Design a protein around this ligand. Structure first.
Ligand SMILES: Cc1cc2nc3c(=O)[nH]c(=O)nc-3n(C[C@H](O)[C@H](O)[C@H](O)COP(=O)(O)OP(=O)(O)OC[C@H]3O[C@@H](n4cnc5c(N)ncnc54)[C@H](O)[C@@H]3O)c2cc1C
Ligand SMILES: CCCCCCCCCCCCO[C@@H]1O[C@H](CO)[C@@H](O[C@H]2O[C@H](CO)[C@@H](O)[C@H](O)[C@H]2O)[C@H](O)[C@H]1O
Ligand SMILES: Cc1cc2nc3c(=O)[nH]c(=O)nc-3n(C[C@H](O)[C@H](O)[C@H](O)CO)c2cc1C
Ligand code: FES
Ligand code: FES
Ligand SMILES: [K+]
Ligand code: NA
Lengths: 405, 392, 248, 201, 446, 197
């Protein structure tokens, strides 16, 4: 008897609670599709139903916001200017946004949650993206762990980008075995020392990564780039191998990949001060464009310096180009130090890490290391060493630009 | 062993350090002096307290035992016959010296164990954490040893100080970094952990087998007319309590001694007269209120403010425990509110809390929790003026 | 899809409610028996009957204990469901309870039920002793105890505090067997038929007719226990009932 | 195994997370209550996760919070009936916290974070592990509070008491509110000095 | 007009004589890079170069357009740098009299000069570095402007010179400087002086405010709080009276005025007095044959807030108008913290010294203790007359809470404002550096 | 009257946070800034002041034994109704604030998702059932308990802010020291232990 009374009361109670909630939802949660103005252009204006994150809404339209960490608010590559709406800046956003930036209006599109009408002032790069499916031309290995990738524009013309930029390459799920990779006999022996071909990579889901360009703006038709193969740490074998760098290496002439337009905030200063470039590994790509940009695109007479930290002679590449540019123009001079020359290299120049060679050769006797732009690029270990040296030399952070990969 | 050695070397000799920047001249006041002035300020209360504890014990012993019965008791306790071997006498005709000596045998072991056990925790934390030993423990040890019954077991004192030093102070960084009062934190641990040894009628007098209520407990039972001392059968007048000729924890009985000690440090500015002024205002206002309301059943309602002052540990708590700069509010306006809360809370526990005869410790420990809030309220008001440019 | 949302909740609510209702209705009798057994054991313990296990406790309780309802106003037996009576609930309703005045409320109990429950212990076919539920406020919380009074109506056969919130060591000593065992042999009343139980502070004299040593350093709880007896043995408590016991 | 033991010391609901502390400060006075509370929390969390995961796909977001509350509340009530019918004395000792298992943050946290987006089987294992770790905190605190507070373990006299002609004087603070905080506070210190990875910056 | 009650007038022995006399001939001058907050030098000269009385020595990268000119004309004999190649000083050896010249105007026309013409002339001559923005104690940006310029015509620092004595000799220049400031300022000019009469400007913009009380009354930070409260968006400028005299001389004669009057005082100064010197004058030569034997510390500026004059830094500061020489108190005493302080000075009354009113103390550089955690015994509230909660603010600085420190008024404070709080701290903290570290964090993140 | 005694009982003598260990998770979580803790405290008062009286009506009208039908007691459907009613009211209050009271929604509506089915609310409701409280008594107890809880969280937040200058040993930093701080707070709050007001 009481069982029936309890069941009906239970069903009545739950129905009473949901009904007031559902009735409250209709009369308190206006579902009016939120309309966000993008750059103030009515055509760019996007109308979307309430809910989700600003990153998803923007991606739906023709505006694409560069994002690496995704919907986590961890990288900060999706910074947007929210003129109005969105509420106060979340505490998690402030970890990657300075207070001054918050005053201007910088916000992370992924982190911010869309709940009301907002005003946006997105830049041209986000406003418009040059998503193209370029065709792979050449994939020869420049060094032991570095490959030069040449891309053919599918739509003609050339990608609009500034020196030191990068392109966000998108790839789908794929399985690539390192044995599929093709390497020159010179670099094959070094690979055969440990026989890295045994590795196999299986990308279960599509991934998106960034790669700095290696072509100066005046170059039209072929988009030079340098790619470093991603491999498990030598001391931590229990790690899946490279997923994106492995996939790009597997490709050869005739393959196709998407660039999703250019991006990057790496550039030189339109001043008369001296430039001092220093690169390592994949970092030589942006540096090469910068040297070429300042030699013919701008024909700058400003003093130029290049120092490359290398482990062995086989690692070095593009040397002939550096020799020609240094020889053709005296304003630019290049040097390279070897941390461990091969016995057959017979190197008779600088030996050791650049962090101490550079100071003992150039910065020690220079009249103003601070009054010189520095463009650091290389493995994190070198960055920590050089930054400590540069800091011990008295160079402001604003005076030094670093692009870690 | 660098930390302890440096403290000993710096203790004997002032450091030869010189200013490195900013103000090249520094005020002569240092933490080492501030602690010693406070430590010396409680000496009059400590010395009288030893005399009082022995004097009360001797009267009770004579009043209870006599003849061969008394002699057997004396030989049965190490406190008594030790006093005899040093020239004291347990007879009623004992002079001030014997009374002071007997109290010393009851106080010094409590002070010694508290200092040794408390010191070990202080040095252990500083040694392990690579800090320099602070001198704030010197004040902490003595004050804890002066807010405990004379008959407190030594092992209880070691546990009490360990809680007061470790849990309340060291885990917060040490001297100047905690929010609670360490000495009262230790006593509150004893209060709730082993109430039988820090409450009742068998702890406040060092006479074996003697059961005698204190002035505060007696007042609650039967009001002013219930104030009688069973050791001598003489009525306890206000002068007796103010001077400190009453049973109770050593160091708190004498309000006159604490007033002399508290007056010196208040004059030197070490102890805030605002906190003391706040406590008095709180105690007077609430005690006077209870007088007006009256209570035909609760005798405590009719206790005047001046009786609240000289009874229990109110004087000791107001002077040498509520003035702890670290646990008090850091603003002058907040200090008044912090002091008033202590005075109000102490009277409330005394009157409307039958469980606890006295509440000065719980009043201070309760006030230490809200000291930041009185600071926060004052600060926010100041911030509001700043945003308005102070009406300029 | 509101139709789907209504379906999932309805089906989920029914199955969950059905299981809950079956468990609630199905196990209700068991829970009541468990609650009853807790008091039945204590009544046996004060009665001095050794029982262990639910089967023995219930069997012994039925055979040896005869609960009855007593009216405090007249101290006379009344007819009712003694086994299924809740005095605490009655004291909270004005229908079966009265509001004590300040003078009468010696034990500091807000209300006193008009009819109380007592448990007669019959060794054979005749009562040997009576157990009275006496409760009063202590220092922290209400203290409830069972007092065993012999057929004479004066001697107390035993005592047990089956519910008391007090500080262990000081006020919780009421649970101590030695202190409880001290009450055996004491006489509740005097020749004048007036309450005589006194809790002597610091220890009652040895061999005292009505002297029980008070709890050490716990005068507040000892005072509460004294008030509980001083009241329940008075006019408004079991006084009139106890007088009837003395003569039968 | 790794998932089962992960929330014991690596992702403890009370050491790392701040879920389930209401009961740890109350039902830890004795081991009998703490152990029985642990089983109730383990059983409820595991059962609630299994059912939420089973119906996770069809759960309506509009009433997902009420849906998970009902299943959790229903399971708690059934356990409550079992506790009252059997172990009635323990139910009295647990008092109202038996009914508060519905609000115990462990049940909602795992029923939402994991159960809603996991298969029924792994969700059930996760619930048991979360309760098992929460039990480790409960029993460790309960072991110290009961041993040093009463000289007993599971009601068995381990340290003879002076009241029973023994030698050990019970610590009255161990039976009060502050003792639970200090024991858990020092527990975290001990956990995090062996596992510095959890230290907060 | 305004009276300050809380504060600590240090009765350090060896006060000046308030008499202006010729100082020792100076053959070495320097510019101290560290003296300027947030200044990254862009060197415009090298060792061995020949500079003139106003030739630029270096620029500020983070304050473009601000030129630091050479105080005197000579040869750059060294560029002392330090850790991180931080520019400790740029030393010039005086030899010659060549000097740059600028436009000169009659005193009557100064008030009517265009604001931009005033700014460029000050920037060109390098006198623009005299100004300091209170919120961060940085030289004002060239394009920036402020509605309140505070002229500190009072010197309450211990052993400090009397501004009235100095100004009375340069009455015309001071009035001329005020007129230029009146035109430069967007709002008003506050001439914060004492009760003593000073030359007055007829311009309605200039206003005279009288401050009375202990030392804190004489600081520009104290004046700004009482007159023009400063915040993130309310910026005020500070300039000492001597610099104002230079401004007047600059616009009257068209030549940079570098002569200054500084009080060479201290316990070990045989004949303390005011001495005419030059900006950046080498203190080693200035105090030559004027100090008692023994190990002493030469300090540029007040002992409360000054710079140690050793090695590269042994030159008068840009904003320092006083030289204090103190004994080195490295001696260790037995139970020195327990003795009665007959000769010990303290804000608290725990020493016998306070009983003997009117005493003068031969203070040394000893810290009088070791570094300990702050134990607030009310000392801070006794020396801070501003409407702030000093104890809570100092706790925020110690903890590094920039956000809370700003809310409590850290922006309105300069390192000098906390000199007394450093002086009276039982824990022996250096709140000057803590505030500077906090202010830098606010600027960088801002 | 009797109501004023009840209000003081629910705040000081009986504190939900420290004396009952209710809502500790949200009491040891948002106890980092005074303002945010202040916001939760006022929000908990609103939820309690509306949950306790509403739950009192339902219990005395539906779940009370021998209330709807003689001989049948629906007490076994106690937790479902209390937890269900609490969840509904908190959500309803949040949505109306976000629609009609923008400024309050940020001040209060932000924390309601945290108070949803919180131990403080359920415990305060459950203790009402364990006693016999009239509608007037229930509302005062609901408001009183919430204020008492707000007092503990704000006091803890103030102490945690004062601890900005503390040097907590690593491992005790964050949660570990907060437990010890909460324990010390409980020790002080035990001053009102034996007060029958
Ligand atoms: C602006 C910008 C420019 C860049 N330019 C270049 C460039 O020119 N060239 C270049 O090579 N890179 C560049 N990068 C870095 C690039 O994003 C990738 O790090 C790189 O291309 C390798 O891709 P990956 O995803 O395989 O690396 P990851 O896999 O993310 O690298 C992680 C490391 O662990 C291994 N690993 C693989 N899978 C896993 C896993 N699941 N868990 C743990 N470890 C794993 C990898 O082998 C690698 O050693 C740039 C990045 C940025 C932001
Ligand atoms: C037992 C006796 C002691 C306890 C009783 C006394 C408690 C006193 C503390 C009350 C709580 C603190 O109250 C504090 O009030 C200040 C005003 O100064 C408020 O100050 C703040 O208010 C609003 C938010 O409401 C903010 O936007 C504003 O910037 C600021 O002024 C704090 O937000 C609040 O936290
Ligand atoms: C006036 C004054 C009173 C003090 N009172 C106490 C006290 O009651 N208990 C204590 O442990 N320390 C006391 N100290 C020492 C110290 O300040 C205290 O332990 C702080 O809590 C340490 O942070 C006192 C110090 C001073 C100057
Ligand atoms: S995508 Fe990384 S911060 Fe938004
Ligand atoms: S279990 Fe988290 S609030 Fe109670
Ligand atoms: K009392
Ligand atoms: Na006294």
């Amino acid at each position: 008897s009481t069982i029936i009374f309890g069941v009906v009361m239970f069903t009545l109670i739950i129905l009473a609670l949901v009904l007031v909630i559902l009735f409250a939802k209709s009369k308190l949660v206006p579902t009016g599709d939120i309309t966000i103005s993008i750059n103030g252009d009515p055509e760019k204006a996007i109308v979307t139903q309430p809910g989700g994150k600003l990153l998803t809404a923007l991606a739906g339209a023709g505006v694409f916001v560069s994002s690496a960490c995704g919907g986590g608010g961890s990288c900060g590559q999706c910074r947007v200017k929210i003129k109005s709406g969105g509420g106060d800046i979340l505490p998690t956003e402030l970890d990657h946004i300075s207070k001054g930036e918050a005053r201007e209006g910088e916000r992370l599109a992924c982190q911010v949650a869309v709940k009301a009408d907002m005003d946006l002032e997105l830049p041209e790069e986000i406003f418009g993206v040059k998503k193209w499916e370029c065709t792979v031309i050449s994939n020869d290995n420049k060094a032991t762990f570095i490959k030069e990738l040449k891309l053919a524009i599918p739509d003609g013309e050339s990608v609009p980008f500034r020196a030191g930029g990068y392109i966000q390459i998108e790839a789908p799920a794929h399985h690539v075995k390192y044995a599929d990779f093709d390497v020159p006999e010179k670099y094959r022996g070094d690979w055969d020392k440990f026989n890295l071909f045994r590795y196999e990579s299986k990308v279960d889901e599509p991934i998106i990564r960034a790669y700095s360009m290696a072509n100066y703006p005046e170059e039209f038709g072929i988009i030079m780039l340098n790619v470093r193969i991603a491999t498990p740490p030598p001391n931590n074998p229990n790690v899946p191998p490279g997923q994106m760098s492995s996939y790009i290496w597997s490709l050869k002439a005739g393959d196709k990949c998407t660039i999703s337009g250019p991006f990057g905030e790496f550039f030189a200063k339109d001043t008369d001060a001296e430039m001092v470039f220093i690169g390592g590994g994949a970092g030589m790509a942006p540096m090469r464009s910068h040297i070429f940009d300042q030699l013919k695109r701008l024909k700058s007479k400003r003093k130029m310096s290049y120092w490359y930290g290398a482990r062995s002679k086989r690692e070095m590449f593009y040397v002939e180009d550096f020799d020609g540019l240094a020889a053709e123009n005296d304003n630019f001079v290049w040097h390279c130090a070897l941390s461990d020359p091969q016995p057959e290299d017979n190197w008779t120049g600088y030996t050791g890490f650049i962090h101490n060679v550079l100071y003992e050769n150039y910065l020690k006797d220079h009249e103003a290391p601070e009054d010189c732009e520095y463009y650091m690029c290389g493995p994190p270990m070198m960055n920590a060493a050089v930054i400590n040296m540069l800091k011990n030399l008295g160079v402001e952070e604003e005076n030094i630009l670093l692009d870690d990969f | 062993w660098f930390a302890l050695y440096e403290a000993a070397a710096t203790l004997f000799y002032t450091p030869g350090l010189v200013t490195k920047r900013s103000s090249h001249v520094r005020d002569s006041v240092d933490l080492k002096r501030i602690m010693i002035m406070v430590w010396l300020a409680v000496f009059p209360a400590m010395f009288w307290g030893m005399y009082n504890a022995g004097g009360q014990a001797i009267a009770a012993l004579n009043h209870l035992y006599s003849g061969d019965q008394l002699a057997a008791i004396v030989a049965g306790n190490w406190h008594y016959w030790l006093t005899e071997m040093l020239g004291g006498t347990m007879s009623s005709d004992a002079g001030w010296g014997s009374k002071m000596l007997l109290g010393a045998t009851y106080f010094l072991p409590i002070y010694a164990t508290v200092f040794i056990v408390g010191g070990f925790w202080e040095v252990l934390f500083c040694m392990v954490r690579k800090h320099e030993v602070n001198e704030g423990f010197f004040v902490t040890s003595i004050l804890f040893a002066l807010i405990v019954p004379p008959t407190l077991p030594l092992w209880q004192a070691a546990l009490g100080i360990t809680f007061g030093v470790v849990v309340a102070k060291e885990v917060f960084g040490g001297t100047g970094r905690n929010f609670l009062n360490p000495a009262l934190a230790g006593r509150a641990f004893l209060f709730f952990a082993y109430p039988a040894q820090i409450s009742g009628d068998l702890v406040w007098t060092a006479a074996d087998g003697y059961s005698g209520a204190t002035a505060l407990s007696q007042w609650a039972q039967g009001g002013a007319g219930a104030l009688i001392n069973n050791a001598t059968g003489q009525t306890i007048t206000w002068m007796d309590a103010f001077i400190g000729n009453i049973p109770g924890s050593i160091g708190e009985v004498s309000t006159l001694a604490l007033m002399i000690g508290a007056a010196f440090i208040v004059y030197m500015g070490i102890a805030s007269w605002r906190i003391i002024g706040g406590v008095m205002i709180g105690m007077i206002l609430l005690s006077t209120l209870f007088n007006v309301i009256g209570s035909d059943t609760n005798a405590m309602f009719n206790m005047p403010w001046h009786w609240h002052l000289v009874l229990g540990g109110f004087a000791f708590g107001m002077f040498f425990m509520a003035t702890d700069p670290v646990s008090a509010s850091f603003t002058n306006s907040g200090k008044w509110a912090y002091g008033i809360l202590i005075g109000v809370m102490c009277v409330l526990i005394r009157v409307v809390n039958p469980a606890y005869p006295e509440g000065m410790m719980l009043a201070i420990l309760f006030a230490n929790l809200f000291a930041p809030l009185f600071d926060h309220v004052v600060v926010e008001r100041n911030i509001k003026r700043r945003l308005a440019r102070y009406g300029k | 899809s509101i139709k789907k949302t209504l379906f999932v909740v309805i089906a989920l609510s029914l199955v969950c409610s059905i299981i809950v209702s079956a468990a609630a209705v199905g196990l209700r009798d068991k829970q009541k028996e468990n609650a009853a057994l807790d008091k039945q054991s204590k009544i046996l313990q004060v009665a001095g009957i050794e029982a262990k296990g639910s089967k023995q406790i219930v069997e012994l309780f039925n055979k040896s204990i005869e609960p009855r309802l007593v009216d405090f106003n007249t101290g006379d037996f009344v007819e009712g469901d003694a086994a299924n009576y809740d005095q605490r609930k009655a004291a909270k309703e004005a229908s079966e309870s009265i509001k004590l005045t300040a003078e009468q409320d010696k034990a500091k109990i807000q209300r006193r039920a008009n009819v109380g429950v007592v448990y007669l212990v019959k060794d054979g076919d005749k009562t040997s002793k009576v157990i009275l539920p006496v409760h009063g406020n202590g220092l922290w919380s209400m203290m409830y105890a069972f007092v065993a009074v012999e057929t004479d109506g004066n001697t107390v056969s035993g005592l047990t505090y089956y519910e008391q919130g007090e500080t262990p060591g000081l006020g919780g000593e009421v649970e101590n067997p030695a202190w409880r065992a001290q009450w055996v042999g004491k006489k509740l009343f005097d020749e004048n038929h007036k309450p005589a139980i006194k809790i002597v502070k610091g220890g009652a004299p040895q061999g005292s007719e009505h002297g029980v040593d008070g709890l050490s350093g716990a005068t507040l709880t000892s005072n509460g226990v004294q008030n509980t007896f001083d009241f329940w043995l008075g006019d408004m408590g079991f006084g009139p009932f106890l007088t009837k016991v003395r003569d039968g | 195994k790794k998932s089962v033991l992960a929330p014991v010391l690596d992702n403890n609901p009370i050491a790392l997370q701040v879920l389930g502390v209401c009961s740890a400060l109350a039902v830890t006075t004795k081991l009998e209550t703490a152990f029985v509370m642990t089983l109730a929390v383990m059983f409820v969390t595991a059962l609630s996760n299994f059912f939420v995961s089973l119906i996770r796909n069809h759960i309506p977001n509009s009433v997902r919070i009420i849906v998970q509350m009902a299943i959790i509340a229903s399971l708690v009530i059934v356990v409550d009936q079992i506790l009252k019918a059997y172990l009635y004395d323990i139910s009295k000792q647990l008092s109202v916290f038996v009914g508060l298992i519905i609000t115990n943050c462990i049940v909602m946290g795992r029923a939402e974070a994991f159960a809603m987006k996991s298969e029924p089987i792994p969700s059930f294992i996760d619930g048991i592990g979360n309760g098992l770790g929460y039990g480790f905190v409960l029993m460790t605190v309960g072991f110290f509070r009961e041993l040093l507070g009463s000289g007993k373990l599971f009601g068995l006299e381990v340290l003879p008491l002076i009241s029973n002609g023994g030698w050990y004087q019970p610590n009255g603070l161990m039976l009060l509110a502050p003792s639970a905080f200090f024991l858990i506070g020092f527990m975290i210190w001990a956990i995090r000095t062996f596992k510095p990875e959890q230290v907060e910056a | 007009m305004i009276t300050i009650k809380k504060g600590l007038d240090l009765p350090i022995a060896g006060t000046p004589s308030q008499v202006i006399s010729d100082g020792k001939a100076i053959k070495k001058v320097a510019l101290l890079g560290e003296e300027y907050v947030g200044m990254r030098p862009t060197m415009h000269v090298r060792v061995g170069d020949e500079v003139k009385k106003a030739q630029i020595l270096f620029e500020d990268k983070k304050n473009p357009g601000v030129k630091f000119t050479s105080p005197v004309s000579g040869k750059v004999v060294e560029i002392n740098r330090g850790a991180k190649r931080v520019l400790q000083s740029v030393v010039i050896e005086v030899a010659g009299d060549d000097q740059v010249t600028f436009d000169k105007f009659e005193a009557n026309q100064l008030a009517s000069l265009n604001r931009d013409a005033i700014k460029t002339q000050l920037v060109e001559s390098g006198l623009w570095t005299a100004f300091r923005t209170r919120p961060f104690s940085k030289v004002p940006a060239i394009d920036s402007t402020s509605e309140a310029i505070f002229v500190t015509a009072m010197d309450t620092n211990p052993l400090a010179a009397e501004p009235t004595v100095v100004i009375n000799e340069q009455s015309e220049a001071f009035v001329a400087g005020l007129d230029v400031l009146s035109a430069l300022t967007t709002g008003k000019v506050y001439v914060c002086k004492k009760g003593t009469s000073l030359p007055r400007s007829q311009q309605p913009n200039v206003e005279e405010h009288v401050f009375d009380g202990p030392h804190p009354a004489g600081l520009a930070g104290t004046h700004m709080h009482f007159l023009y409260p400063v915040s993130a968006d309310h910026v005020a400028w500070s300039i000492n009276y001597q610099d104002v005299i230079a401004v007047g001389q600059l616009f009257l004669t068209g030549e940079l005025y570098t002569q200054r009057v500084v009080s060479l005082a201290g316990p070990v100064v045989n004949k303390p007095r005011l001495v005419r010197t030059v900006m950046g004058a080498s203190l080693e030569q200035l105090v030559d044959s004027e100090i008692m034997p023994g190990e002493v510390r030469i300090i540029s500026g007040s002992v409360l807030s000054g710079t140690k004059a050793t090695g590269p830094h042994a030159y008068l500061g840009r904003y320092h108008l006083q030289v204090s020489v103190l004994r080195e108190g490295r001696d260790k005493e037995l139970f020195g913290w327990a003795m009665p302080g007959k000769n010990k000075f303290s804000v608290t009354r725990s020493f016998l010294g306070h009983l003997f009113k009117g005493q003068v103390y031969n203070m040394t550089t000893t810290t009088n203790g070791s570094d300990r955690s702050m134990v607030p015994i009310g000392n801070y509230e006794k020396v801070m007359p501003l409407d702030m909660e000093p104890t809570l603010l100092l706790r925020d600085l110690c903890a590094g809470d920039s956000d809370s420190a700003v809310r409590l008024g850290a922006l309105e404070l300069d390192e000098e404002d906390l000199a007394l709080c450093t002086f009276v701290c039982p824990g022996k903290y250096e709140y000057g550096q803590l505030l500077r570290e906090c202010l830098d964090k606010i600027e960088k993140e801002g | 009257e009797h109501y004023i005694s009840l209000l003081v009982k629910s705040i000081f003598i009986e504190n939900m946070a420290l004396s009952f260990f209710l809502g500790m998770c949200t009491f040891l979580a948002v106890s980092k800034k005074v303002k945010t803790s202040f916001g939760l405290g006022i929000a908990v008062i609103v939820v309690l002041t509306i949950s306790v009286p509403v739950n009192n009506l339902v219990y005395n009208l539906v779940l009370k034994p021998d209330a709807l039908v003689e001989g049948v007691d629906l007490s076994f459907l106690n937790f479902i109704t209390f937890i269900g009613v609490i969840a509904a009211l908190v959500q309803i209050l949040e949505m109306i604030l976000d629609r009609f009271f923008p400024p309050l929604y940020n001040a209060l509506g932000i924390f309601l998702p945290l108070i949803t089915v919180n131990c403080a609310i359920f415990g305060g409701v459950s203790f009402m059932v364990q006693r016999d409280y009239s509608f007037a008594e229930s509302v005062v107890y609901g408001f009183g308990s919430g204020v008492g809880w707000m007092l503990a969280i704000v006091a803890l937040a103030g102490i945690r802010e004062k601890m900005k200058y503390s040097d907590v040993p690593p491992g005790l930093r964050g949660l570990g020291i907060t437990f010890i701080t909460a324990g010390l707070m409980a020790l002080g709050f035990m001053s009102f232990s034996g007060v029958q007001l």
